[model samples]
Target: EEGKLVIWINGDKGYNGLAEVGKKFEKDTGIKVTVEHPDKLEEKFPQVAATGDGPDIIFWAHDRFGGYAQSGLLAEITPAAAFQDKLYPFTWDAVRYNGKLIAYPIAVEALSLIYNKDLLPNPPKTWEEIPALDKELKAKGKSALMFNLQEPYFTWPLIAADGGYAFKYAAGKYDIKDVGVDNAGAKAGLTFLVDLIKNKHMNADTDYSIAEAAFNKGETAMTINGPWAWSNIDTSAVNYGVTVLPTFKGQPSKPFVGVLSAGINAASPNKELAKEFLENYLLTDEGLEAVNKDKPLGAVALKSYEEELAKDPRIAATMENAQKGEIMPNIPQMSAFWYAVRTAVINAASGRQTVDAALAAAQTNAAAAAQLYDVMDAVPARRWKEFVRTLGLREAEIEAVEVEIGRFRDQQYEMLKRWRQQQPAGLGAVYAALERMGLEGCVEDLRSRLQRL
Candidate 1:
């Protein structure tokens, strides 16, 4: 019983917070704890999983948990069955998948509006009101808001609250059948941002550092960010206020709420002991007190931590705001949305295409890629006309179609390349699209009567 438990955790505030508690747990119970950074965790976890000799526990963000879960690397933690009142509900929601609870929640975080008290005594009630507020500030020649404008994830939640979503759900689950990333709600969201850029309400050049400078210099009234930015808040200059973002209508915009938790190794010989220590230490009051000391993030322990957090003005607003944030979806096909979302948003922001056109194209490309990867089903069409409209294909997208078809053979790709090079200059792109999607099967069983030609 003199052995220690090794925990690999992200190199973030949450882990440092856990280390403080780990020291306490060792003194109370005889289990020594070792904490290591995520990179080291990544390198060593596999070897350890392969051999059953790695850390007894590990902590990581919920967003990053899918890889390990899919690999059957994480051990199920039934804290509800074992430690009931000690766990927080939302934290459990963040780590559970397919009815099995895999990790124990430690801390929670999400975005909010951080304003310079010197510039604006009151920020807008909601994001929709920001436009008019911007106009009022423009009259006074001072910007009302500033952000990394081109970063969609930071700015796009308003679109979701506005009734747009990256993926549409038909029954209860995500509907691959109905994707709205390019349509109504998404369009409104993109247009709102585009209008902001066009109207000069905010500078598109403002990056992370730039926005931080704008806030520190008191050049803008407010900036959008999460609790992590507290480390960078320039307290020496002016007072600052952090609050929940303004909602559209009465519905709140959901920021990306990230939760981190610890999962055990399935193959560990000490799983029972690991589970006991995890429940007795990480999910207890002593563990939470340890975490709360490192940063302003609220703990998911009993309801008591909520009251404890509310006493601090800065931490209270953030903790309350996080309740309105959305759980990052854990669907398997979600990775496709991630790749296409960034590329589409970047293209639209760059003015390469209308937001609508870019979204539709991005959707089609992602769906097609998904089909090839067996992530989504492929639609069967008998002819080119059907291929063009049904699959949302366009003329300039020939390069993509060729790459898709090129997955089949070296000879077929080389033959098509030569054919395109020899085509009348402007027609090559068109030719590739036709040959790739059209030649998907064959012209016919033999052109039936071509035997005489």
Candidate 2:
């Protein structure tokens, strides 16, 4: 009770805003609170936490909680009923793992439409309007829209715009087995982005810094980003506005929602003081206000702060967008999803593949990566096909595979890969199908190379 409490926040805002609050917390309770900003929290937190040598309480988006909690790295916490009821409803879902609350939920964030009112006043309500808006902007020497092209997080609103999703969430649990990224709705979302790039309404090469610069200097009229980026925008230069994301094909674009929370370390020696400080100092309006002051959080989760937080338009708009957003799936399987979509978007953006081809591969990759550690599944079929041709096989040997594997087009051994996961019997069928014309177990060389079942 007499010792200090350690916590970590993201490096974007760092701990600058918490200086006064930490000092006051120490002054009042004689319990020192140290706020830290560390790079690589994504990789660092879990590694350090397992060794039981990291922060007592950590601040991170809820998407990361499931991994930590499952590893027993985070302590389950109980908030007072009064405070818990004061938080946004979905906020609980963010911190809960296996029905136990693991983090002190604070705020919600999603990708909202940020636009330059001077260029395009009254943001268009639908994605179809971007073409005309692009023409108008072209005459003014600007582009209609620009965001990080390869960033799955920035582009997910559009990708999920119609009906795309990484996994199905229902009744508070993500059906990792039910990935929807390859569905028609998802295909529509990917198509919209591709057509936008193809028609030149949006830049295909835009990156985080470049897009922000383009928007801040008023060269791009609109962007999709979250509240964490508000601090970086140059409001003093342009007349800008924030609003809910534009609809795509007559349906709302649902971006992923991330809940930011502070959770205690299960292994911490200072659990009681940590909880006391959170409830008494950090969760209070004063502490919340101080945190929001330096750099706005994705909308503040506390309903009481709505009035104060709404003074920042982007924060308010992001909150509204968040209401329609799906809480980011925090399961470890989602890590594979994060990998699956990035490569998918990047593949399409690079012009290496068409939108449909890119999406089909991503679905297979997501399913394969989620279940197994095999890297071959994530590689596009064309690459594996090319890889097979180089194995120095004669045309007849290669044709043998193509004849059996259904012509290795965009789906090389795709069916085989799917069957491999079905059952050990299916695996036996896999070898036998390739077993004919080969010496006894003759395809083992190829099978071993491809990591096939």
Candidate 3:
């Protein structure tokens, strides 16, 4: 009996590509494969896959890789050394977690300045060009520039247009507390965006959908979008161009580039077959082109595909910007980033708050979200009873404390806040309790991170 395989992909383009690849794989290796598009894949993957009866293959972005790898859902697999060198250098960062390979990078997505070449053949090198373009386009009864004012993904280039960052990574690990969201460079960036809305050059309420609609209809001259956008916007008669983001003041704009990847399911019985299809078939030039055929993701993982697009202006512009873009951080802590910055951007852009006020508020708000709750969650819930026991109650009485605290172990932020209700000193009391148990390393490490919030 030929091997059997099941695969899950979210997008139609990927589903179609792999469905085609599966046919080829079956002919070559006698492996019967089925590709499916799962609804609520992210929420359902963990619950269903852990039962050891899930898809043999998965297609998703790198950010979710950390969560999946840590949860034991993804199987470890490595690429050939020579094959690894054939892909874009940046994409390599997205496929690996904690120095181990877990997936194969497929496409790279990032923000770039997409414009109508019919209206403006040359792209702006600096943000300074926006005002004049705005004035000219307005006279023609058209809008100049538009982008999602509230999206941190789109607005991040502005926030880091000078030298701002949400978190710093140094010597291979993130220094999570070294936040620079409200720093001078970031302040200047947000100020520039607010000025655009204030000067009436762009709409304060504009979003990705609004911007896309206007751009597609030719009501707008230039807009910011990514590679996947080309599928719908680039038509038979369309004359559009793509380029790297413009500079703010004197520095470059850094859009966050997200990497899409495919991985094997640890629980799949046909895991070996899944790996063969991914490494031998999916990574090939024919396979990458097929995935990108009907709906292009704008960028590809392979340098060969990059070279294939070299003669095309869109490829040169897209790949050039892809290299210059920032790699989006793939961590649970990023939840705080979206929460903090999106509100701040909307407030400032809508004239509800000044740039200074908005950034200041966002930084402080973000700091709380990055609190030591994450540190507490790192210690196993089973071991938590040991730490609480050190706080000194009777053997039977300590069991009650464990019962109360263990419930919130998965939710450390709420747990820490609730624990402090009875012991108001917060982490200070917990820190001392751990030290008393001779867990000096645990106490010190916890304090180093906990004290940040």
Candidate 4:
């Protein structure tokens, strides 16, 4: 049992150093740990683990832990008191799924203002100052600031600043039913951005690539981007300074905080050993030094490493920004919010819908998407009911089960149509796969559903 352990991680160079740390772990304990870099860990991990085969530990973002946990692929582990106390509170919150600690937080990240020192010399303290700064930049043929307007991840800062949120967080959990994408604050935020676009402060046509390129090329004065952008900016000639996002009408322009985390597989045979390596070794000072050997990818979650990390000016700025942002919800329901909010923001920015109407439509879309998820949630149970029927259950005995199954299948069919109305790519292959899996009769019955998302 102590001879070997397998860990799956991203192919980043930092993980290459982590593999070296694994070798050290073997020296400390008799366990020889091997780290593997695999393609599509998000999709592949759950599929392989379902068959009871894969690495003992998986490294990934906390945001994706929800679907994996719900699918019963992750083991919930309560770290030792000493271990928990060493890390940031927000990191613990990030790793929780439904109230259970599902992973160990490794790195924290959030968006912040990256401005050219030469362009502004001083950063704006409030969102109101942006318009004037934009005017000044325009006079000099440069953009004051820009971000990907079509992305909800970028736009949420504005929404949050005005008091809007994607979902309600209460009692340490998110209420999925309580969507806030179209709240009053959301309307105000989107309206303000739309006005800015009209006034030439920002461009609706700008996307991530465009915005980053403009900033790096010195065409734009500033951009809202994460730590990952620093590598490119460092290579560029731009003199930049990083700071927390400015307040909007006095409320914090809070970005979403994301975390990279490691979790043991629920079915991993070496559960205790995995926990030892993760908690005792990997999160320690020596372990993090190896992991951050290449460059600090993001700030470490442990307080012990904070001062050491902050000594790096870039990491210092990023850590400060992370402190000012809201933790991104790591719930499965958040998937629908991303699509819904992005669509609403894009529609509003494109002038295809008024700000109020766009956000209202987004709320409606979010509610419907949630309802569809509910129907999909019932599919496995209903399929079990079909199995029971095949076992000669009497109609009178299983009549209610049959009734519910019928309702859910019909519900799923309608939901499929609704999903396809907005997204149609890759669905044909999805349907093809379903047909190839010996669901011909069922596939034919739900052909339209099979032909789409």
Candidate 5:
């Protein structure tokens, strides 16, 4: 049964040295495993999960499994199949939900501060310390923070630092109903962002490319961002140092960790084959090496590889601080939090509403979505109570509403058709009735049908 195994992966999995690793795995194991990059990246995996058809194994992050896991579309791996100790504590922890290992943690990522050494000999440990530094920079006509704000992704960590979590994590559980978007912590983060604008310490357009350009040109002194910025950021212009985010309310401004994993589909006809590939490709050292050659992501498995990446002087300090940050739990409820928090934060930033109002609204929105009917909207209001009887819809029948509205609409369509089919004089009377009934176009479509009749 082991000739070639087809695996579906998001295109971002990259085409660097991974192809060679595939060839090597096949050569060594006599199993030719093929990787398929789907054209519709987002829809493919979800559709497969929904329809119970598709690839044997999926290479995606745990965050993408919200629907699949909640709907029982995914098969939980035997705990023994996933070697716990071999994986990083944080990465392993992110994949386990409710004592079930739903994903194979393959890649890890963390946020770190990038600074110019020439400008600040020692980085500040607290966000409060930044204002004086900004003042000093302002005297010298320099800026303090390098940031990009086009997406809420750029500003979420700051919101998190002030205790404004997107969703609430409780006693080994997650509930979407407890979104704290408008909490003091989140507002404090938002205030910090506005400070950047007012204090002249940071500019809003400091995107990845712009940051790189500014860093190379020596225009920016500090930037809060992720690891991908390391390889491409200009290092030659000034001595640079990487550090953890400054403490806000005694907690680090924690960035969300996006961990990629090999997820299995329960409905696959080749179930055992899929599990075998997942085990071989993601669990063992050879498999890990095959999948990640240069391993661009933060190391999720193997202490030695993590040490090697940490050895780089620039990446070392930040990585150490990152150890304190939690790998965001990949529970199903995380989605509700992610979106709700983002909405609250965006509204706060835009001044569309107060931070308190926005967060409260987000919580309310989530609660309503979670089946709290008092907070929930009446869906399809008209026909839900319609009955086919003479007195209209009966009480307590949802279909009756729909029946009444549908019948009215159908009758209108039919009357319109009949009016259009009649002689001009008859049509005038019908039109007059329709006018009186406030349904002026009642017989418009029926004229076409009548011509054919």
Candidate 6:
């Protein structure tokens, strides 16, 4: 079947790389592959997909797969055994939704220790070595390392190294019901950070810019960051090196690794062709080589290509660091997790609260945020049934809609709860969620009836 296949890649350097491959795919298969770079894929994809009008294949991050999978917007991916064996093992977990693979993981990013080779002749192998190294640097009027203390992403390695996690992973899924930010490990990590500030004299005022500036100016010997920092250092003319973060108390500092992935639209008319293009063409070593030609931000996930790409010292170092990291969970509940973690880190570092107290607050805040939509549970199902009864739908239709309402409740709650936090917010989130669920009109009727009383 000769049909046009549309693929949406992010409007960035990666887009240029993918477009190059799209040209080759078109030549090989006689399938007209159109590569479109949309800057707002995150916002546009879901909305357009809901209407059954979007790309057949879309390039994005693994973390976004959950929402799309839950909304039934993504096609369940079934890679051939050969294809599955070619990919990085960690990436499989990244793209799955409740045990179902929903996306093809292409690239991976994680945190690493970036140090100036001049100041640090050798990378420290453990947390204990860091303070001693810093002492030597301080004697020479240089600091050891610095990062944005308020940033949760930067500090997450420390937290996880101490055995704290945002959620418990069990039965092959994240148990959202269990948040571990206030656990013993998280407290230890936070306390360690606070002690570094108080005893090591590491500046608590260090933000991203400040930390980068210090590193660039050779005032600091090392910093914990990702591949993104390389550009800043390159332009600043700093001789730097990258490696995995040192272990704390003999436990590895497990950074959250984010993956770049591609997912097919569940509503795509050409599912077979989309599958063929991804599995047969895009996921191979040649395909990834084409995609990684540009200054790729992350390491490609294909094991064959990753090894080849690692021949470059920079990519090799990042790959080593990524190998030790954990894939970041992509569930929608992460919105609350980030906010809570950030608040706790900032509070603890700034002396507003003890590390223990700060962690306890983060745990409480995250739990509350996750349950923000619990208020919707208060809207009785009987009331919804009565409301739908007034909609003039037949008994069968009413039941179908009610069943959907029940299924869509958690997703709708997440959307509206986020909306309530955004600007120009009021009942707009409520209206949007109901409209998507096809219950907005009936809900309005219910509201009117209540007002009339």
Model 4 error, position 35 (Å): 6.9
Question: How much lDDT does candidate 5 score?
Answer: 0.58
Candidate 4 per-residue lDDT, tens place, 288-355, comes to 87877644557888789876877877787776767766788887656566667777888889899998
Q: Model 4 Cα RMSD, Å?
A: 11.4
Tens-digit per-residue lDDT, 66-147, candidate 3:
6556444567877678888988777888877777777888888777898888878887889988998889989999977887
Tell me the lDDT of model 4 at 247.
Answer: 84
- Residue 183 of model 2 has an lDDT of 92
> What TM-score against the true fold does each predicted structure earn?
0.68, 0.77, 0.75, 0.72, 0.67, 0.69
C-alpha displacement of 220 in model 3, angstroms? 0.8
> Which numbered prediction scores highest in TM-score against the true structure?
2
Q: Candidate 5 on 315-378: residue-level lDDT in tens?
A: 5654565575555656544544555555665566556776677667766654533332221112
- Candidate 3 regions off by >4 Å? 1-15, 26-56, 80-90, 351-353, 371-373, 376-453
Residue 175's lDDT in candidate 5? 62
The TM-score ranking, best first, is: 2, 3, 4, 6, 1, 5
- Alpha carbon lDDT at 367, candidate 5: 50
Better of 1 and 5 by TM-score: 1
Backbone Cα, N, C clashes tallied per candidate: 1, 0, 0, 0, 15, 0
Off by over 4 Å in 5: 1-15, 28-44, 48-56, 79-85, 88-90, 129-142, 151-154, 198-200, 203-209, 212-218, 234-239, 267-274, 282-295, 307-319, 370-453
Q: What are the per-residue Cα lDDT tens digits for candidate 6 across 237-354?
A: 6788887788888888877777888888755667788888788787887777676664365687888877776776777777776667677787856656776788788889889989
Candidate 1 residue lDDT tens string, 385-416: 34445655443433243232332222223323
Which residue runs does candidate 4 get wrong by more than 4 Å?
1-57, 267-277, 293-297, 311-323, 371-377, 380-453
CA shift of 8, model 4, Å = 6.0
Per-candidate Cα RMSD to the true structure, in Å, reads 13.6, 12.5, 10.4, 11.4, 14.7, 10.3
What is the per-residue lDDT of model 2 for residues 1-453, given as tens digits with 9 covering 90 to 100?
Answer: 238887888876536676567888889887788888888675566555523356777888887777566544566788878878888777887788888888888878788898988888899999989899899889989988888876788888888878888878788566767888889998888888888888878767789888888888888999877776676675548888889889998888888888888887755668888888787777778888787777777677787876677777677678678777777877756666776788778888778988888888778767655543122233343454565565553433223333223221212232234344551112322343333324543466365548744
